[PDB]
Design a binder for this molecule. Structure first.
Ligand code: HEC
Ligand code: HEC
Ligand code: HEC
Lengths: 104, 104, 104
């Protein structure tokens, strides 16, 4: 595989939601560092859909090749954009900030 | 709730689509200034889905807690990304612009 | 139509995914230069959905007016955000890059 071309593909189609560096930050999507040889939905600090959290497979060339071809087909129920916040604590904190920030 | 903590959440999951400050601009989503105590779909100058426009509830701790847990469940039909432009005149202006810029 | 207003509409609701200038880059969506008088899904260098690729209509005021009011109704199956990579080649390159970058 051509790593050089890979980078460019990532910048145009993935970077908007993903970071790859170690210690990288979470955005719309989880940080991808340490992806290979690891099971789906295990990036620390990120809240996945139950589907991505339980797909159960290990990310590698074969699995990635099939997933990236059609994510929704490989993992029915996965969501690429905001679909809500599960943790009650998280929602509470967000709402606290909102009651303050939107009340200038 | 924790205001600080909530800000990091907003920045990571909401900022790309929402502004909170008074007079702040609409983006993909409506500016959220004066959210609390206001009825759904009432931000001046933003075109909501008929669903969000007519949900008929008032934004507050409880209503927001349920909505943020699962947006589309609370307001079936709500759209997070471009789903079209209702106003005929707006589509006309936009098209006149494209007619100019894409042929230049 | 009012081009000046049209430019404002495009900046707020289209710019994030589309460029218009000749030689413009492809982002989430395809560069739109040369849109008028061309068949759907004909932008060089962009991988459209089979739906957008074969809608078979010519982009003109009449067609755009309908499309812009409700895209998915006009072209069912069309996707506005990442829905997968068709070409096995790109997937291999992307995966080769990830293999390196995510392993820092
Ligand atoms: C935002 C609009 C995204 C774009 C564009 C891309 N991805 Fe993504 N990805 C996104 C989210 C929110 C999620 C999780 C969804 C869920 O169901 O919880 C993901 C997840 C992945 C994963 C799996 C990670 C894991 O299981 O730990 C991979 C491997 C992945 N995304 C890859 C990927 C690539 C390579 C992209 C560009 C081609 C890409 N994504 C774009 C959000 C978004
Ligand atoms: C990203 C979040 C987008 C936004 C916002 C807008 N568009 Fe888009 N558009 C996007 C994609 C990914 C695609 C292709 C979808 C597919 O099925 O492959 C498109 C396509 C168009 C087209 C047709 C291009 C062609 O036939 O060659 C047009 C005419 C178009 N989009 C226009 C457009 C305008 C004017 C927008 C704002 C009002 C707009 N798009 C937003 C992604 C996104
Ligand atoms: C991307 C686009 C987003 C993201 C990532 C978030 N929201 Fe927001 N939001 C968006 C839109 C286009 C709409 C309106 C949808 C429709 O018309 O059906 C909204 C609306 C809200 C609302 C209700 C506003 C109102 O009734 O006046 C709220 C309270 C809201 N969104 C909040 C919100 C928060 C706190 C987010 C982060 C967790 C968030 N959104 C993300 C679009 C988008």
């Amino acid at each position: 595989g051509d790593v050089e071309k890979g980078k460019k593909i990532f910048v145009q189609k993935c970077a908007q939601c993903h970071t790859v560096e170690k210690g990288g930050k979470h955005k719309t999507g989880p940080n991808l560092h340490g992806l290979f040889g690891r099971k789906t939905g295990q990036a620390p600090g990120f809240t996945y859909t139950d589907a991505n959290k339980n797909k159960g497979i290990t990310w590698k060339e074969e699995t990635l090749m099939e997933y990236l071809e059609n994510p929704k087909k490989y993992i029915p129920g996965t969501k690429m954009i905001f679909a809500g916040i599960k943790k009650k604590t998280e929602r509470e904190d967000l709402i606290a900030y909102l009651k303050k920030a939107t009340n200038e």
